[PDB]
Amino acid sequence: MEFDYVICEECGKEFMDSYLMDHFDLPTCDDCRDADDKHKLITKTEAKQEYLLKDCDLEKREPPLKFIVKKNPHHSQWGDMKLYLKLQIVKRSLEVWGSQEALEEAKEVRQ
Ligand SMILES: [Zn+2]
């Protein structure tokens, strides 16, 4: 009868908003984490581009990855700001090359 909660589909954790479900559009909970201490997201520009990619991938299958977009929450607040969950951004960096080390090596090997 009328709800307003959600359970993390990753491991199953009721909740409503945290670091990804509070300003990202992704539920998750304070258990999956990603940075071991915060899961600090990663700028969408340094997330895919750096991961050797930029669109055409995360929109080719339409995965459960969400992003934020607005003034930065920490110090320094430029005009707009596009960010993408870091954990999910890592799952893709591998799905493509398979590891952030295969990326760093792909850019150091290529010209
Ligand atoms: Zn979870």
mmCIF file of N, CA and C and ligand atoms in Angstrom:
data_model
loop_
_atom_site.group_PDB
_atom_site.id
_atom_site.type_symbol
_atom_site.label_atom_id
_atom_site.label_comp_id
_atom_site.label_asym_id
_atom_site.label_seq_id
_atom_site.Cartn_x
_atom_site.Cartn_y
_atom_site.Cartn_z
ATOM 1 N N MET A 1 0.861 -1.217 0.000
ATOM 2 C CA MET A 1 0.000 0.000 0.000
ATOM 3 C C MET A 1 0.884 1.249 0.000
ATOM 4 N N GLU A 2 1.295 1.697 -1.155
ATOM 5 C CA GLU A 2 2.158 2.910 -1.220
ATOM 6 C C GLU A 2 3.534 2.588 -0.632
ATOM 7 N N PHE A 3 4.572 2.745 -1.407
ATOM 8 C CA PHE A 3 5.938 2.447 -0.891
ATOM 9 C C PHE A 3 6.854 3.631 -1.143
ATOM 10 N N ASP A 4 8.120 3.444 -0.910
ATOM 11 C CA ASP A 4 9.083 4.535 -1.157
ATOM 12 C C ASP A 4 10.469 4.083 -0.743
ATOM 13 N N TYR A 5 10.739 2.860 -1.003
ATOM 14 C CA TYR A 5 12.063 2.275 -0.652
ATOM 15 C C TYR A 5 12.552 1.402 -1.788
ATOM 16 N N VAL A 6 13.689 0.808 -1.609
ATOM 17 C CA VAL A 6 14.248 -0.035 -2.685
ATOM 18 C C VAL A 6 15.293 -0.989 -2.114
ATOM 19 N N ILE A 7 15.512 -2.096 -2.764
ATOM 20 C CA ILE A 7 16.536 -3.054 -2.268
ATOM 21 C C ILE A 7 17.648 -3.150 -3.302
ATOM 22 N N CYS A 8 18.856 -2.983 -2.875
ATOM 23 C CA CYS A 8 19.998 -3.063 -3.824
ATOM 24 C C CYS A 8 19.885 -4.362 -4.615
ATOM 25 N N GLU A 9 19.865 -4.280 -5.916
ATOM 26 C CA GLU A 9 19.748 -5.515 -6.741
ATOM 27 C C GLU A 9 21.104 -6.222 -6.798
ATOM 28 N N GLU A 10 22.158 -5.528 -6.473
ATOM 29 C CA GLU A 10 23.505 -6.153 -6.509
ATOM 30 C C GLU A 10 23.602 -7.235 -5.433
ATOM 31 N N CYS A 11 23.378 -6.882 -4.196
ATOM 32 C CA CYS A 11 23.469 -7.892 -3.106
ATOM 33 C C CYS A 11 22.133 -7.973 -2.362
ATOM 34 N N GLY A 12 21.272 -7.013 -2.556
ATOM 35 C CA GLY A 12 19.960 -7.036 -1.845
ATOM 36 C C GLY A 12 20.080 -6.217 -0.563
ATOM 37 N N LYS A 13 19.844 -4.936 -0.636
ATOM 38 C CA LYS A 13 19.968 -4.098 0.595
ATOM 39 C C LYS A 13 18.925 -2.977 0.593
ATOM 40 N N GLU A 14 17.851 -3.153 1.314
ATOM 41 C CA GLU A 14 16.806 -2.091 1.363
ATOM 42 C C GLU A 14 17.482 -0.727 1.538
ATOM 43 N N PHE A 15 16.819 0.329 1.156
ATOM 44 C CA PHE A 15 17.428 1.682 1.297
ATOM 45 C C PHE A 15 16.569 2.705 0.552
ATOM 46 N N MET A 16 17.116 3.852 0.252
ATOM 47 C CA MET A 16 16.323 4.885 -0.475
ATOM 48 C C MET A 16 17.267 5.865 -1.181
ATOM 49 N N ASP A 17 18.389 6.170 -0.583
ATOM 50 C CA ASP A 17 19.344 7.121 -1.223
ATOM 51 C C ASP A 17 20.659 7.117 -0.444
ATOM 52 N N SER A 18 21.774 7.049 -1.123
ATOM 53 C CA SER A 18 23.076 7.046 -0.387
ATOM 54 C C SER A 18 24.097 7.909 -1.137
ATOM 55 N N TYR A 19 25.044 7.307 -1.807
ATOM 56 C CA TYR A 19 26.038 8.109 -2.565
ATOM 57 C C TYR A 19 25.714 7.947 -4.041
ATOM 58 N N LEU A 20 25.099 6.849 -4.377
ATOM 59 C CA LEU A 20 24.718 6.609 -5.785
ATOM 60 C C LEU A 20 23.199 6.748 -5.900
ATOM 61 N N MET A 21 22.492 6.393 -4.859
ATOM 62 C CA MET A 21 21.004 6.500 -4.879
ATOM 63 C C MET A 21 20.582 7.856 -4.330
ATOM 64 N N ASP A 22 21.521 8.713 -4.102
ATOM 65 C CA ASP A 22 21.192 10.046 -3.552
ATOM 66 C C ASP A 22 21.486 11.104 -4.601
ATOM 67 N N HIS A 23 22.497 10.879 -5.381
ATOM 68 C CA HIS A 23 22.853 11.875 -6.433
ATOM 69 C C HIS A 23 23.417 11.165 -7.665
ATOM 70 N N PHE A 24 22.826 10.075 -8.070
ATOM 71 C CA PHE A 24 23.356 9.355 -9.265
ATOM 72 C C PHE A 24 22.218 8.690 -10.051
ATOM 73 N N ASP A 25 21.192 8.244 -9.366
ATOM 74 C CA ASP A 25 20.042 7.548 -10.032
ATOM 75 C C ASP A 25 20.281 6.046 -9.919
ATOM 76 N N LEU A 26 21.024 5.666 -8.921
ATOM 77 C CA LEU A 26 21.344 4.231 -8.691
ATOM 78 C C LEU A 26 21.269 3.970 -7.244
ATOM 79 N N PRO A 27 20.559 2.937 -7.016
ATOM 80 C CA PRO A 27 20.230 2.501 -5.697
ATOM 81 C C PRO A 27 21.470 2.023 -4.941
ATOM 82 N N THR A 28 21.869 0.806 -5.134
ATOM 83 C CA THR A 28 23.073 0.302 -4.414
ATOM 84 C C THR A 28 22.935 0.636 -2.928
ATOM 85 N N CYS A 29 23.929 0.333 -2.142
ATOM 86 C CA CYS A 29 23.848 0.642 -0.689
ATOM 87 C C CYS A 29 25.255 0.891 -0.148
ATOM 88 N N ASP A 30 25.383 1.078 1.136
ATOM 89 C CA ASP A 30 26.727 1.323 1.725
ATOM 90 C C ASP A 30 27.427 -0.016 1.975
ATOM 91 N N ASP A 31 27.369 -0.915 1.030
ATOM 92 C CA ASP A 31 28.032 -2.234 1.212
ATOM 93 C C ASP A 31 28.843 -2.562 -0.043
ATOM 94 N N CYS A 32 28.275 -2.347 -1.199
ATOM 95 C CA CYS A 32 29.013 -2.633 -2.458
ATOM 96 C C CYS A 32 30.242 -1.725 -2.522
ATOM 97 N N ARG A 33 30.060 -0.470 -2.227
ATOM 98 C CA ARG A 33 31.201 0.486 -2.247
ATOM 99 C C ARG A 33 32.016 0.315 -3.531
ATOM 100 N N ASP A 34 33.165 0.936 -3.599
ATOM 101 C CA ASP A 34 34.012 0.812 -4.819
ATOM 102 C C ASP A 34 35.393 1.417 -4.562
ATOM 103 N N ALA A 35 35.479 2.448 -3.764
ATOM 104 C CA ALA A 35 36.819 3.040 -3.486
ATOM 105 C C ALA A 35 37.328 2.495 -2.154
ATOM 106 N N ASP A 36 36.610 1.556 -1.591
ATOM 107 C CA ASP A 36 37.008 0.951 -0.301
ATOM 108 C C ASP A 36 36.711 1.909 0.854
ATOM 109 N N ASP A 37 36.496 3.155 0.557
ATOM 110 C CA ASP A 37 36.234 4.148 1.630
ATOM 111 C C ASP A 37 35.195 5.171 1.175
ATOM 112 N N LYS A 38 34.760 5.101 -0.051
ATOM 113 C CA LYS A 38 33.807 6.131 -0.532
ATOM 114 C C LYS A 38 33.268 5.836 -1.931
ATOM 115 N N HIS A 39 33.979 5.078 -2.700
ATOM 116 C CA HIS A 39 33.533 4.783 -4.089
ATOM 117 C C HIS A 39 33.497 6.091 -4.882
ATOM 118 N N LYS A 40 34.344 7.022 -4.528
ATOM 119 C CA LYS A 40 34.385 8.331 -5.228
ATOM 120 C C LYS A 40 34.103 8.147 -6.722
ATOM 121 N N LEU A 41 33.067 8.768 -7.218
ATOM 122 C CA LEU A 41 32.738 8.632 -8.665
ATOM 123 C C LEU A 41 33.916 9.110 -9.515
ATOM 124 N N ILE A 42 33.747 9.126 -10.807
ATOM 125 C CA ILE A 42 34.844 9.585 -11.704
ATOM 126 C C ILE A 42 34.254 10.460 -12.812
ATOM 127 N N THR A 43 34.825 11.612 -13.041
ATOM 128 C CA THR A 43 34.293 12.510 -14.104
ATOM 129 C C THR A 43 33.964 11.688 -15.352
ATOM 130 N N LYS A 44 32.832 11.936 -15.953
ATOM 131 C CA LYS A 44 32.452 11.170 -17.173
ATOM 132 C C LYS A 44 33.513 11.372 -18.255
ATOM 133 N N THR A 45 34.199 12.483 -18.228
ATOM 134 C CA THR A 45 35.244 12.737 -19.257
ATOM 135 C C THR A 45 36.462 11.855 -18.977
ATOM 136 N N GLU A 46 36.920 11.826 -17.756
ATOM 137 C CA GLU A 46 38.107 10.988 -17.427
ATOM 138 C C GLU A 46 37.662 9.554 -17.126
ATOM 139 N N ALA A 47 36.389 9.281 -17.207
ATOM 140 C CA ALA A 47 35.903 7.902 -16.917
ATOM 141 C C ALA A 47 35.957 7.039 -18.183
ATOM 142 N N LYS A 48 35.220 7.412 -19.193
ATOM 143 C CA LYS A 48 35.204 6.604 -20.455
ATOM 144 C C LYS A 48 36.390 6.992 -21.339
ATOM 145 N N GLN A 49 36.435 8.228 -21.763
ATOM 146 C CA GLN A 49 37.561 8.677 -22.622
ATOM 147 C C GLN A 49 38.841 8.047 -22.096
ATOM 148 N N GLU A 50 39.137 8.275 -20.832
ATOM 149 C CA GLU A 50 40.351 7.676 -20.200
ATOM 150 C C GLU A 50 40.280 6.176 -20.310
ATOM 151 N N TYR A 51 39.119 5.625 -20.103
ATOM 152 C CA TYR A 51 38.995 4.156 -20.182
ATOM 153 C C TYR A 51 39.102 3.711 -21.651
ATOM 154 N N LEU A 52 39.529 4.604 -22.509
ATOM 155 C CA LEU A 52 39.690 4.308 -23.954
ATOM 156 C C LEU A 52 38.326 4.153 -24.595
ATOM 157 N N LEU A 53 37.437 5.052 -24.294
ATOM 158 C CA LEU A 53 36.079 4.964 -24.896
ATOM 159 C C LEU A 53 35.303 6.255 -24.630
ATOM 160 N N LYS A 54 34.222 6.460 -25.331
ATOM 161 C CA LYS A 54 33.421 7.698 -25.124
ATOM 162 C C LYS A 54 32.045 7.525 -25.770
ATOM 163 N N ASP A 55 31.136 6.888 -25.086
ATOM 164 C CA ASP A 55 29.775 6.686 -25.660
ATOM 165 C C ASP A 55 29.820 5.567 -26.701
ATOM 166 N N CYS A 56 28.675 5.115 -27.147
ATOM 167 C CA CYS A 56 28.632 4.022 -28.164
ATOM 168 C C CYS A 56 28.798 2.663 -27.477
ATOM 169 N N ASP A 57 29.213 2.652 -26.239
ATOM 170 C CA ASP A 57 29.398 1.374 -25.519
ATOM 171 C C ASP A 57 28.330 1.261 -24.443
ATOM 172 N N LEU A 58 28.302 2.236 -23.590
ATOM 173 C CA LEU A 58 27.330 2.251 -22.468
ATOM 174 C C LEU A 58 25.929 2.540 -23.003
ATOM 175 N N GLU A 59 25.817 2.795 -24.271
ATOM 176 C CA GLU A 59 24.488 3.055 -24.864
ATOM 177 C C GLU A 59 24.243 1.974 -25.904
ATOM 178 N N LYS A 60 25.200 1.097 -26.073
ATOM 179 C CA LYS A 60 25.039 0.018 -27.061
ATOM 180 C C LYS A 60 24.232 -1.117 -26.429
ATOM 181 N N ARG A 61 24.358 -1.293 -25.140
ATOM 182 C CA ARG A 61 23.599 -2.380 -24.459
ATOM 183 C C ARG A 61 22.624 -1.767 -23.452
ATOM 184 N N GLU A 62 22.954 -0.626 -22.910
ATOM 185 C CA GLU A 62 22.045 0.021 -21.922
ATOM 186 C C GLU A 62 22.143 -0.713 -20.581
ATOM 187 N N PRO A 63 23.310 -0.660 -19.991
ATOM 188 C CA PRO A 63 23.581 -1.308 -18.701
ATOM 189 C C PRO A 63 22.964 -0.519 -17.541
ATOM 190 N N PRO A 64 23.038 -1.094 -16.365
ATOM 191 C CA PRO A 64 22.499 -0.478 -15.140
ATOM 192 C C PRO A 64 23.470 0.570 -14.584
ATOM 193 N N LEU A 65 24.056 1.371 -15.432
ATOM 194 C CA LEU A 65 25.007 2.409 -14.944
ATOM 195 C C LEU A 65 24.327 3.779 -14.978
ATOM 196 N N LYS A 66 24.466 4.551 -13.933
ATOM 197 C CA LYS A 66 23.823 5.894 -13.913
ATOM 198 C C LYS A 66 24.889 6.973 -13.716
ATOM 199 N N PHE A 67 24.526 8.210 -13.907
ATOM 200 C CA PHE A 67 25.509 9.308 -13.741
ATOM 201 C C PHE A 67 24.843 10.503 -13.069
ATOM 202 N N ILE A 68 25.626 11.419 -12.577
ATOM 203 C CA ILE A 68 25.050 12.624 -11.947
ATOM 204 C C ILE A 68 25.307 13.790 -12.891
ATOM 205 N N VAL A 69 24.805 14.945 -12.589
ATOM 206 C CA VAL A 69 25.026 16.083 -13.506
ATOM 207 C C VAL A 69 24.528 17.368 -12.845
ATOM 208 N N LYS A 70 25.430 18.150 -12.334
ATOM 209 C CA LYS A 70 25.029 19.422 -11.671
ATOM 210 C C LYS A 70 26.248 20.057 -11.000
ATOM 211 N N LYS A 71 26.058 21.156 -10.323
ATOM 212 C CA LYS A 71 27.206 21.823 -9.647
ATOM 213 C C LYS A 71 27.928 20.812 -8.754
ATOM 214 N N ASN A 72 29.227 20.908 -8.663
ATOM 215 C CA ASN A 72 29.985 19.949 -7.810
ATOM 216 C C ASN A 72 29.575 20.135 -6.345
ATOM 217 N N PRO A 73 29.524 19.041 -5.626
ATOM 218 C CA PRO A 73 29.149 19.037 -4.209
ATOM 219 C C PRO A 73 30.333 19.467 -3.337
ATOM 220 N N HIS A 74 31.532 19.188 -3.769
ATOM 221 C CA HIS A 74 32.724 19.578 -2.964
ATOM 222 C C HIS A 74 33.140 21.006 -3.318
ATOM 223 N N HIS A 75 34.270 21.442 -2.831
ATOM 224 C CA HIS A 75 34.732 22.826 -3.137
ATOM 225 C C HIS A 75 34.774 23.029 -4.653
ATOM 226 N N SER A 76 35.015 24.234 -5.092
ATOM 227 C CA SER A 76 35.069 24.499 -6.558
ATOM 228 C C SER A 76 33.736 24.106 -7.198
ATOM 229 N N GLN A 77 33.018 25.059 -7.727
ATOM 230 C CA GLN A 77 31.710 24.738 -8.366
ATOM 231 C C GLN A 77 31.621 25.438 -9.723
ATOM 232 N N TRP A 78 32.144 24.827 -10.751
ATOM 233 C CA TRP A 78 32.090 25.457 -12.100
ATOM 234 C C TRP A 78 30.648 25.435 -12.614
ATOM 235 N N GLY A 79 30.448 25.766 -13.861
ATOM 236 C CA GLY A 79 29.066 25.764 -14.418
ATOM 237 C C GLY A 79 28.435 24.385 -14.209
ATOM 238 N N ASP A 80 28.311 23.614 -15.253
ATOM 239 C CA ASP A 80 27.705 22.260 -15.109
ATOM 240 C C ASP A 80 28.813 21.229 -14.887
ATOM 241 N N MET A 81 28.454 20.023 -14.539
ATOM 242 C CA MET A 81 29.489 18.978 -14.307
ATOM 243 C C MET A 81 28.901 17.599 -14.616
ATOM 244 N N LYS A 82 29.505 16.878 -15.524
ATOM 245 C CA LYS A 82 28.987 15.524 -15.874
ATOM 246 C C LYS A 82 29.833 14.460 -15.173
ATOM 247 N N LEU A 83 29.220 13.628 -14.374
ATOM 248 C CA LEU A 83 29.992 12.586 -13.655
ATOM 249 C C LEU A 83 29.375 11.212 -13.916
ATOM 250 N N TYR A 84 30.122 10.164 -13.692
ATOM 251 C CA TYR A 84 29.578 8.793 -13.914
ATOM 252 C C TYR A 84 30.009 7.887 -12.758
ATOM 253 N N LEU A 85 29.127 7.052 -12.274
ATOM 254 C CA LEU A 85 29.505 6.151 -11.146
ATOM 255 C C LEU A 85 30.880 5.539 -11.433
ATOM 256 N N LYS A 86 31.729 5.465 -10.442
ATOM 257 C CA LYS A 86 33.090 4.895 -10.665
ATOM 258 C C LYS A 86 33.029 3.364 -10.695
ATOM 259 N N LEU A 87 32.359 2.763 -9.752
ATOM 260 C CA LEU A 87 32.276 1.274 -9.735
ATOM 261 C C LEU A 87 31.810 0.756 -11.095
ATOM 262 N N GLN A 88 30.648 1.160 -11.515
ATOM 263 C CA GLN A 88 30.116 0.691 -12.825
ATOM 264 C C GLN A 88 31.078 1.092 -13.940
ATOM 265 N N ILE A 89 31.662 2.252 -13.838
ATOM 266 C CA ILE A 89 32.620 2.693 -14.887
ATOM 267 C C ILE A 89 33.778 1.695 -14.949
ATOM 268 N N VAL A 90 34.088 1.071 -13.848
ATOM 269 C CA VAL A 90 35.206 0.086 -13.842
ATOM 270 C C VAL A 90 34.733 -1.211 -14.494
ATOM 271 N N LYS A 91 33.530 -1.616 -14.198
ATOM 272 C CA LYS A 91 32.998 -2.872 -14.795
ATOM 273 C C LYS A 91 33.046 -2.765 -16.319
ATOM 274 N N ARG A 92 32.877 -1.582 -16.843
ATOM 275 C CA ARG A 92 32.914 -1.413 -18.322
ATOM 276 C C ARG A 92 34.368 -1.373 -18.798
ATOM 277 N N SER A 93 35.195 -0.582 -18.166
ATOM 278 C CA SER A 93 36.623 -0.507 -18.591
ATOM 279 C C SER A 93 37.152 -1.923 -18.833
ATOM 280 N N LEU A 94 36.719 -2.873 -18.051
ATOM 281 C CA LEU A 94 37.192 -4.266 -18.243
ATOM 282 C C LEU A 94 36.390 -4.916 -19.368
ATOM 283 N N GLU A 95 35.094 -4.855 -19.282
ATOM 284 C CA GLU A 95 34.249 -5.465 -20.348
ATOM 285 C C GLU A 95 34.857 -5.145 -21.717
ATOM 286 N N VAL A 96 35.502 -4.016 -21.833
ATOM 287 C CA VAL A 96 36.138 -3.642 -23.136
ATOM 288 C C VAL A 96 37.544 -4.242 -23.202
ATOM 289 N N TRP A 97 38.468 -3.678 -22.471
ATOM 290 C CA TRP A 97 39.858 -4.196 -22.484
ATOM 291 C C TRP A 97 39.979 -5.336 -21.482
ATOM 292 N N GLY A 98 39.310 -5.221 -20.374
ATOM 293 C CA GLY A 98 39.364 -6.307 -19.359
ATOM 294 C C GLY A 98 40.088 -5.828 -18.101
ATOM 295 N N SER A 99 40.718 -4.685 -18.147
ATOM 296 C CA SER A 99 41.436 -4.202 -16.933
ATOM 297 C C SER A 99 41.975 -2.795 -17.162
ATOM 298 N N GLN A 100 42.041 -2.006 -16.125
ATOM 299 C CA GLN A 100 42.578 -0.630 -16.277
ATOM 300 C C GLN A 100 44.054 -0.730 -16.654
ATOM 301 N N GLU A 101 44.632 -1.893 -16.498
ATOM 302 C CA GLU A 101 46.068 -2.064 -16.857
ATOM 303 C C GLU A 101 46.169 -2.371 -18.347
ATOM 304 N N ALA A 102 45.123 -2.897 -18.912
ATOM 305 C CA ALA A 102 45.128 -3.188 -20.368
ATOM 306 C C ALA A 102 44.869 -1.872 -21.086
ATOM 307 N N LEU A 103 44.280 -0.942 -20.385
ATOM 308 C CA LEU A 103 44.001 0.387 -20.969
ATOM 309 C C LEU A 103 45.272 1.204 -20.906
ATOM 310 N N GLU A 104 45.761 1.404 -19.723
ATOM 311 C CA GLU A 104 47.015 2.188 -19.564
ATOM 312 C C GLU A 104 48.069 1.624 -20.518
ATOM 313 N N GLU A 105 48.061 0.333 -20.716
ATOM 314 C CA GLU A 105 49.055 -0.288 -21.635
ATOM 315 C C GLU A 105 48.637 -0.045 -23.084
ATOM 316 N N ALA A 106 47.360 0.007 -23.345
ATOM 317 C CA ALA A 106 46.897 0.237 -24.743
ATOM 318 C C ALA A 106 47.247 1.663 -25.185
ATOM 319 N N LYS A 107 47.266 2.592 -24.270
ATOM 320 C CA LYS A 107 47.591 4.000 -24.636
ATOM 321 C C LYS A 107 49.109 4.202 -24.640
ATOM 322 N N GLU A 108 49.830 3.427 -23.877
ATOM 323 C CA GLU A 108 51.313 3.589 -23.850
ATOM 324 C C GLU A 108 51.922 2.792 -25.004
ATOM 325 N N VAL A 109 51.208 1.815 -25.484
ATOM 326 C CA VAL A 109 51.720 0.988 -26.608
ATOM 327 C C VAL A 109 51.396 1.679 -27.928
ATOM 328 N N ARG A 110 50.195 2.157 -28.058
ATOM 329 C CA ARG A 110 49.792 2.846 -29.315
ATOM 330 C C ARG A 110 50.511 4.194 -29.412
ATOM 331 N N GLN A 111 50.351 4.884 -30.508
ATOM 332 C CA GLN A 111 51.024 6.205 -30.662
ATOM 333 C C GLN A 111 50.176 7.291 -29.998
HETATM 334 ZN ZN ZN B 1 24.226 -3.421 -2.505
#
